[PDB]
């Protein structure tokens, strides 16, 4: 029971064609693809009920379909414009069991013009105010993912090889590094909170984990700067008296 | 199932306060309706569903919805707010059981959840790491709900809106905002601007 699609972001220049890939373990007979954006909920683009059959869902125009075998529904946009800028949603089910409709976890599709001007963030971590300490003894780390686009990243904090989610915030939106600029920079701060003695405790390790998603390997780059592939950057620290 | 409408795409509410979200829906056929949660990061996730039975559903994480066939509606309640709830949900239609048949969705409805701050003391801090560089970091934490947070009239000065905190073990929460600039003309005492609390301590 898992529908997977091909990957979970995607950066595309306008007039590219593009292949989404949709897949599913579950011998469904039905597979939707629906796009989703801020205001408009979701809304259907096309579907299949079988082998090689297709239908127009609400809003096909600028899609085409490829259903090829029971298990994969890929989708096609023939020429990428800035607005089929999207999260892709695809779902399968049964037309003979209860259960309804399983939803993969969504591809996010950027177009944009440009010369591939997507940059890895750089991340800064900034230790706890020595003030916070005294006055409350709680402690809060923050961390800056930074020098971003586009807006493809996911933050994450670990301490002493865990995860935690207990004590974090991010921003659930990037501020434009510099709003006039069309195709503008990001950035994105998140914040993590211990007790002081957790953090006056030099045995534990404190690191800023940033996922971006840029470029693949079918991409070329010949600019002279390493290629912003998928990749993570990060920022450490440690406990201190 | 012809179509889905969620009247009001935002719903702010304390935590502790009655949660309500809007479904209604056009259907020439008997419908079959579903309320579906999207969290940060997941996909949709089902949270209950009207079959030709039960009118009134229970769904999961304490959610429950009245099928109201009379005026067309489906609303989504839970009767004490949660800050885990904080989440976008959609309303969708069904012309049959069978999964088979397509869903038409809602336009969406974003959930916020305030909380409850029981002791704030409102703090401007600095914090300059000493690792890279740049280091010009002012954390605003620990103030109230109430209070809010206008983006920079500077522009080489860069801040972010609130945010809430959960220290679970302490039972603890919190709000920060953060603010930051490379300007080295800039200094905490004054990073933050609007509507700012006399209390606040440095």
């Known amino acids: 029971v898992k529908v997977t699609q091909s990957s979970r972001y995607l950066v595309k220049r306008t007039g590219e064609k593009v292949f989404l890939e949709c897949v599913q373990d579950?011998?469904?007979?039905?597979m939707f693809w629906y796009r989703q954006d801020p205001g408009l909920g979701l809304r259907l683009i096309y579907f299949?009920?079988?082998?090689?059959?297709?239908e127009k869902g609400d809003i096909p125009e600028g899609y085409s379909v490829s259903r090829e075998k029971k298990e994969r529904f890929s989708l096609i946009l023939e020429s990428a414009s800035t607005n089929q800028t999207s999260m892709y949603l695809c779902?399968?089910?049964?037309?003979?069991?209860?259960?309804?409709?399983?939803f993969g976890s969504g591809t996010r599709l950027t177009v944009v013009e440009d010369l591939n001007k997507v940059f890895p963030p750089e991340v800064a971590v900034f230790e706890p105010s020595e003030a916070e300490i005294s006055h409350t003894q709680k402690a809060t780390l923050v961390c800056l993912a930074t020098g971003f686009f586009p807006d493809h990243v996911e933050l994450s904090w670990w301490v002493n090889g865990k995860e935690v989610h207990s004590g974090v915030c991010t921003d659930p939106q990037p501020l434009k590094e510099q709003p006039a600029l069309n195709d503008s920079r990001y950035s994105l701060s998140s914040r993590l909170r211990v007790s002081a003695t957790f953090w006056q405790n030099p045995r534990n390790h404190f690191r800023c984990q940033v996922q971006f998603y840029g470029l693949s390997e079918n991409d070329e780059w010949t600019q002279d700067r390493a290629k912003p592939v998928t990749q993570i950057v990060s920022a450490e620290a440690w406990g201190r008296a | 199932m012809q179509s889905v409408t969620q009247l009001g795409s935002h719903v702010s509410v304390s935590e502790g306060a009655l949660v309500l979200l809007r479904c209604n829906y056009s259907?020439?056929?008997?419908?079959?309706l579903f309320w579906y949660v999207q969290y940060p990061n997941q996909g949709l996730q089902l949270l209950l569903k009207?079959?030709?039975?039960?009118?009134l559903v229970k769904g999961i994480n304490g959610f429950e919805a009245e099928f109201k066939k009379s005026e067309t509606s489906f609303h989504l309640t839970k009767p004490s707010a949660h800050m885990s709830d904080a989440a976008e949900y959609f309303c969708?239609?069904?012309?049959?059981?069978?999964?088979?048949?397509?869903?038409?969705f809602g336009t969406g409805t974003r959930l916020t959840i305030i909380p409850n701050i029981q002791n704030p003391d409102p703090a401007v801090y600095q914090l300059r790491d000493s690792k890279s560089s740049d280091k010009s970091v002012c954390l605003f934490t620990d103030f109230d709900s109430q209070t809010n947070v206008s983006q920079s009239k500077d522009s080489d000065v860069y801040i972010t809106d609130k945010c809430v905190l959960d220290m679970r073990s302490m039972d603890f929460k919190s709000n920060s905002a953060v603010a930051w600039s490379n300007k080295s003309d800039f200094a905490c005492a004054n990073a933050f601007n609007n509507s700012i609390i006399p209390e606040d301590t440095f």
């Open positions: 299949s009920y079988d082998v090689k059959m297709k």
């Open positions: 009207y079959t030709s039975a039960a009118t």
């Open positions: 259907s020439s056929v008997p419908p079959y």
């Open positions: 779902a399968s089910s049964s037309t003979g069991l209860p259960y309804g409709y399983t």
């Open positions: 969708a239609v069904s012309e049959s059981p069978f999964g088979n048949e397509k869903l038409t």
């Open positions: 579950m011998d469904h007979e039905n």
